[PDB]
PDB file of all heavy atoms in Angstrom:
ATOM      1  N   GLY N  64     103.998 103.192  97.699  1.00 71.68           N
ATOM      2  CA  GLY N  64     103.486 102.993  99.070  1.00 71.68           C
ATOM      3  C   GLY N  64     104.050 101.716  99.663  1.00 71.68           C
ATOM      4  O   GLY N  64     103.936 100.667  98.997  1.00 71.68           O
ATOM      5  N   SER N  65     104.643 101.788 100.858  1.00 72.16           N
ATOM      6  CA  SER N  65     105.296 100.592 101.452  1.00 72.16           C
ATOM      7  C   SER N  65     105.039 100.536 102.961  1.00 72.16           C
ATOM      8  O   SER N  65     104.758 101.594 103.550  1.00 72.16           O
ATOM      9  CB  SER N  65     106.772 100.585 101.153  1.00 72.16           C
ATOM     10  OG  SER N  65     107.399 101.745 101.679  1.00 72.16           O
ATOM     11  N   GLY N  66     105.108  99.342 103.555  1.00 75.52           N
ATOM     12  CA  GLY N  66     104.965  99.231 105.019  1.00 75.52           C
ATOM     13  C   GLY N  66     104.249  97.961 105.434  1.00 75.52           C
ATOM     14  O   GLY N  66     103.917  97.158 104.539  1.00 75.52           O
ATOM     15  N   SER N  67     103.999  97.798 106.737  1.00 75.29           N
ATOM     16  CA  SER N  67     103.263  96.610 107.247  1.00 75.29           C
ATOM     17  C   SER N  67     102.589  96.963 108.575  1.00 75.29           C
ATOM     18  O   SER N  67     103.100  97.857 109.276  1.00 75.29           O
ATOM     19  CB  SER N  67     104.183  95.425 107.399  1.00 75.29           C
ATOM     20  OG  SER N  67     103.464  94.284 107.842  1.00 75.29           O
ATOM     21  N   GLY N  68     101.488  96.284 108.901  1.00 77.71           N
ATOM     22  CA  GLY N  68     100.770  96.541 110.164  1.00 77.71           C
ATOM     23  C   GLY N  68     100.300  97.979 110.275  1.00 77.71           C
ATOM     24  O   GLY N  68      99.736  98.491 109.292  1.00 77.71           O
ATOM     25  N   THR N  69     100.510  98.604 111.435  1.00 76.96           N
ATOM     26  CA  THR N  69     100.058 100.003 111.666  1.00 76.96           C
ATOM     27  C   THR N  69     100.812 100.994 110.773  1.00 76.96           C
ATOM     28  O   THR N  69     100.165 101.942 110.284  1.00 76.96           O
ATOM     29  CB  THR N  69     100.142 100.364 113.155  1.00 76.96           C
ATOM     30  OG1 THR N  69      99.877 101.761 113.273  1.00 76.96           O
ATOM     31  CG2 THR N  69     101.484 100.041 113.774  1.00 76.96           C
ATOM     32  N   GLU N  70     102.119 100.801 110.573  1.00 77.97           N
ATOM     33  CA  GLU N  70     102.931 101.799 109.822  1.00 77.97           C
ATOM     34  C   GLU N  70     102.730 101.674 108.309  1.00 77.97           C
ATOM     35  O   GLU N  70     102.833 100.543 107.797  1.00 77.97           O
ATOM     36  CB  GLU N  70     104.414 101.633 110.160  1.00 77.97           C
ATOM     37  CG  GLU N  70     104.684 101.504 111.648  1.00 77.97           C
ATOM     38  CD  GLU N  70     104.399 102.747 112.472  1.00 77.97           C
ATOM     39  OE1 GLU N  70     104.454 103.858 111.908  1.00 77.97           O
ATOM     40  OE2 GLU N  70     104.121 102.600 113.678  1.00 77.97           O
ATOM     41  N   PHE N  71     102.473 102.795 107.627  1.00 76.89           N
ATOM     42  CA  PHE N  71     102.364 102.793 106.142  1.00 76.89           C
ATOM     43  C   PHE N  71     102.992 104.087 105.613  1.00 76.89           C
ATOM     44  O   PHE N  71     102.962 105.088 106.353  1.00 76.89           O
ATOM     45  CB  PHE N  71     100.916 102.593 105.690  1.00 76.89           C
ATOM     46  CG  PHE N  71     100.481 101.151 105.624  1.00 76.89           C
ATOM     47  CD1 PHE N  71      99.454 100.678 106.424  1.00 76.89           C
ATOM     48  CD2 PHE N  71     101.103 100.264 104.760  1.00 76.89           C
ATOM     49  CE1 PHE N  71      99.054  99.354 106.355  1.00 76.89           C
ATOM     50  CE2 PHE N  71     100.708  98.938 104.698  1.00 76.89           C
ATOM     51  CZ  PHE N  71      99.683  98.485 105.495  1.00 76.89           C
ATOM     52  N   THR N  72     103.531 104.076 104.389  1.00 72.69           N
ATOM     53  CA  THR N  72     104.251 105.272 103.866  1.00 72.69           C
ATOM     54  C   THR N  72     103.798 105.604 102.443  1.00 72.69           C
ATOM     55  O   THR N  72     103.254 104.703 101.780  1.00 72.69           O
ATOM     56  CB  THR N  72     105.764 105.031 103.805  1.00 72.69           C
ATOM     57  OG1 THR N  72     106.025 104.147 102.713  1.00 72.69           O
ATOM     58  CG2 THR N  72     106.342 104.457 105.081  1.00 72.69           C
ATOM     59  N   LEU N  73     103.995 106.850 102.001  1.00 70.45           N
ATOM     60  CA  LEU N  73     103.662 107.241 100.603  1.00 70.45           C
ATOM     61  C   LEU N  73     104.769 108.167 100.091  1.00 70.45           C
ATOM     62  O   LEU N  73     104.899 109.280 100.633  1.00 70.45           O
ATOM     63  CB  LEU N  73     102.297 107.936 100.564  1.00 70.45           C
ATOM     64  CG  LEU N  73     101.905 108.530  99.212  1.00 70.45           C
ATOM     65  CD1 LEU N  73     101.916 107.468  98.125  1.00 70.45           C
ATOM     66  CD2 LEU N  73     100.546 109.207  99.279  1.00 70.45           C
ATOM     67  N   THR N  74     105.538 107.718  99.096  1.00 71.02           N
ATOM     68  CA  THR N  74     106.685 108.526  98.604  1.00 71.02           C
ATOM     69  C   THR N  74     106.510 108.875  97.125  1.00 71.02           C
ATOM     70  O   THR N  74     106.250 107.950  96.331  1.00 71.02           O
ATOM     71  CB  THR N  74     108.008 107.784  98.829  1.00 71.02           C
ATOM     72  OG1 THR N  74     108.359 107.919 100.207  1.00 71.02           O
ATOM     73  CG2 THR N  74     109.133 108.309  97.964  1.00 71.02           C
ATOM     74  N   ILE N  75     106.628 110.160  96.772  1.00 69.56           N
ATOM     75  CA  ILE N  75     106.595 110.549  95.332  1.00 69.56           C
ATOM     76  C   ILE N  75     108.011 111.023  94.992  1.00 69.56           C
ATOM     77  O   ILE N  75     108.416 112.064  95.535  1.00 69.56           O
ATOM     78  CB  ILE N  75     105.556 111.662  95.086  1.00 69.56           C
ATOM     79  CG1 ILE N  75     104.360 111.562  96.038  1.00 69.56           C
ATOM     80  CG2 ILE N  75     105.120 111.681  93.629  1.00 69.56           C
ATOM     81  CD1 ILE N  75     103.420 110.421  95.730  1.00 69.56           C
ATOM     82  N   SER N  76     108.727 110.300  94.126  1.00 68.50           N
ATOM     83  CA  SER N  76     110.144 110.652  93.833  1.00 68.50           C
ATOM     84  C   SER N  76     110.246 112.022  93.155  1.00 68.50           C
ATOM     85  O   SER N  76     111.142 112.799  93.535  1.00 68.50           O
ATOM     86  CB  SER N  76     110.805 109.577  93.009  1.00 68.50           C
ATOM     87  OG  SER N  76     110.802 108.339  93.702  1.00 68.50           O
ATOM     88  N   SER N  77     109.357 112.304  92.199  1.00 67.04           N
ATOM     89  CA  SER N  77     109.414 113.588  91.451  1.00 67.04           C
ATOM     90  C   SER N  77     108.111 114.363  91.665  1.00 67.04           C
ATOM     91  O   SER N  77     107.032 113.754  91.527  1.00 67.04           O
ATOM     92  CB  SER N  77     109.674 113.356  89.987  1.00 67.04           C
ATOM     93  OG  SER N  77     109.635 114.581  89.269  1.00 67.04           O
ATOM     94  N   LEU N  78     108.198 115.659  91.972  1.00 67.19           N
ATOM     95  CA  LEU N  78     106.966 116.439  92.271  1.00 67.19           C
ATOM     96  C   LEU N  78     106.563 117.262  91.043  1.00 67.19           C
ATOM     97  O   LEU N  78     107.465 117.777  90.357  1.00 67.19           O
ATOM     98  CB  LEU N  78     107.225 117.327  93.490  1.00 67.19           C
ATOM     99  CG  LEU N  78     105.984 117.907  94.162  1.00 67.19           C
ATOM    100  CD1 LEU N  78     104.911 116.842  94.334  1.00 67.19           C
ATOM    101  CD2 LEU N  78     106.348 118.515  95.503  1.00 67.19           C
ATOM    102  N   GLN N  79     105.257 117.369  90.778  1.00 68.74           N
ATOM    103  CA  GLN N  79     104.754 118.120  89.598  1.00 68.74           C
ATOM    104  C   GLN N  79     103.630 119.053  90.069  1.00 68.74           C
ATOM    105  O   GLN N  79     103.066 118.783  91.144  1.00 68.74           O
ATOM    106  CB  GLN N  79     104.253 117.145  88.530  1.00 68.74           C
ATOM    107  CG  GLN N  79     105.321 116.720  87.532  1.00 68.74           C
ATOM    108  CD  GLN N  79     106.209 115.615  88.050  1.00 68.74           C
ATOM    109  OE1 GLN N  79     105.796 114.784  88.855  1.00 68.74           O
ATOM    110  NE2 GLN N  79     107.444 115.593  87.577  1.00 68.74           N
ATOM    111  N   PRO N  80     103.291 120.141  89.342  1.00 67.68           N
ATOM    112  CA  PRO N  80     102.269 121.087  89.802  1.00 67.68           C
ATOM    113  C   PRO N  80     100.906 120.397  89.959  1.00 67.68           C
ATOM    114  O   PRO N  80     100.219 120.691  90.919  1.00 67.68           O
ATOM    115  CB  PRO N  80     102.214 122.154  88.698  1.00 67.68           C
ATOM    116  CG  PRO N  80     102.849 121.492  87.493  1.00 67.68           C
ATOM    117  CD  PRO N  80     103.882 120.546  88.065  1.00 67.68           C
ATOM    118  N   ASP N  81     100.555 119.501  89.032  1.00 72.41           N
ATOM    119  CA  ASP N  81      99.281 118.738  89.122  1.00 72.41           C
ATOM    120  C   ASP N  81      99.303 117.872  90.384  1.00 72.41           C
ATOM    121  O   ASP N  81      98.234 117.708  91.003  1.00 72.41           O
ATOM    122  CB  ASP N  81      99.023 117.914  87.857  1.00 72.41           C
ATOM    123  CG  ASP N  81     100.182 117.013  87.468  1.00 72.41           C
ATOM    124  OD1 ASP N  81     101.245 117.550  87.100  1.00 72.41           O
ATOM    125  OD2 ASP N  81     100.012 115.780  87.538  1.00 72.41           O
ATOM    126  N   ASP N  82     100.474 117.342  90.751  1.00 72.76           N
ATOM    127  CA  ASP N  82     100.577 116.421  91.914  1.00 72.76           C
ATOM    128  C   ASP N  82     100.121 117.118  93.202  1.00 72.76           C
ATOM    129  O   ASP N  82      99.481 116.437  94.024  1.00 72.76           O
ATOM    130  CB  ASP N  82     101.991 115.857  92.069  1.00 72.76           C
ATOM    131  CG  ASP N  82     102.418 114.950  90.928  1.00 72.76           C
ATOM    132  OD1 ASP N  82     101.597 114.721  90.021  1.00 72.76           O
ATOM    133  OD2 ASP N  82     103.574 114.480  90.958  1.00 72.76           O
ATOM    134  N   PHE N  83     100.424 118.408  93.383  1.00 75.46           N
ATOM    135  CA  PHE N  83     100.082 119.044  94.683  1.00 75.46           C
ATOM    136  C   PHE N  83      98.574 118.945  94.918  1.00 75.46           C
ATOM    137  O   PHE N  83      97.811 119.447  94.066  1.00 75.46           O
ATOM    138  CB  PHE N  83     100.454 120.528  94.676  1.00 75.46           C
ATOM    139  CG  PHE N  83     101.930 120.825  94.619  1.00 75.46           C
ATOM    140  CD1 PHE N  83     102.556 121.088  93.414  1.00 75.46           C
ATOM    141  CD2 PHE N  83     102.693 120.854  95.775  1.00 75.46           C
ATOM    142  CE1 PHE N  83     103.912 121.364  93.363  1.00 75.46           C
ATOM    143  CE2 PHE N  83     104.048 121.134  95.724  1.00 75.46           C
ATOM    144  CZ  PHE N  83     104.656 121.387  94.518  1.00 75.46           C
ATOM    145  N   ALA N  84      98.169 118.352  96.045  1.00 73.21           N
ATOM    146  CA  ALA N  84      96.735 118.224  96.402  1.00 73.21           C
ATOM    147  C   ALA N  84      96.640 117.754  97.855  1.00 73.21           C
ATOM    148  O   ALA N  84      97.675 117.324  98.394  1.00 73.21           O
ATOM    149  CB  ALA N  84      96.048 117.253  95.474  1.00 73.21           C
ATOM    150  N   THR N  85      95.455 117.831  98.469  1.00 70.90           N
ATOM    151  CA  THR N  85      95.306 117.262  99.835  1.00 70.90           C
ATOM    152  C   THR N  85      95.345 115.733  99.723  1.00 70.90           C
ATOM    153  O   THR N  85      94.744 115.201  98.770  1.00 70.90           O
ATOM    154  CB  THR N  85      94.043 117.783 100.529  1.00 70.90           C
ATOM    155  OG1 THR N  85      92.925 117.440  99.714  1.00 70.90           O
ATOM    156  CG2 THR N  85      94.070 119.280 100.747  1.00 70.90           C
ATOM    157  N   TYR N  86      96.027 115.056 100.651  1.00 71.84           N
ATOM    158  CA  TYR N  86      96.167 113.577 100.574  1.00 71.84           C
ATOM    159  C   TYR N  86      95.560 112.927 101.821  1.00 71.84           C
ATOM    160  O   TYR N  86      95.921 113.332 102.938  1.00 71.84           O
ATOM    161  CB  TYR N  86      97.637 113.183 100.419  1.00 71.84           C
ATOM    162  CG  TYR N  86      98.209 113.418  99.044  1.00 71.84           C
ATOM    163  CD1 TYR N  86      99.162 114.397  98.820  1.00 71.84           C
ATOM    164  CD2 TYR N  86      97.806 112.649  97.966  1.00 71.84           C
ATOM    165  CE1 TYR N  86      99.692 114.614  97.559  1.00 71.84           C
ATOM    166  CE2 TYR N  86      98.327 112.853  96.700  1.00 71.84           C
ATOM    167  CZ  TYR N  86      99.272 113.838  96.494  1.00 71.84           C
ATOM    168  OH  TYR N  86      99.789 114.037  95.247  1.00 71.84           O
TER     169      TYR N  86
END
Side-chain angles (χ1 to χ4, degrees):
Chain N
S65 60
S67 182
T69 172
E70 313 293 334
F71 276 118
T72 73
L73 173 57
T74 282
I75 328 287
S76 300
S77 176
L78 196 45
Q79 270 81 30
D81 53 293
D82 294 358
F83 293 96
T85 58
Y86 285 111

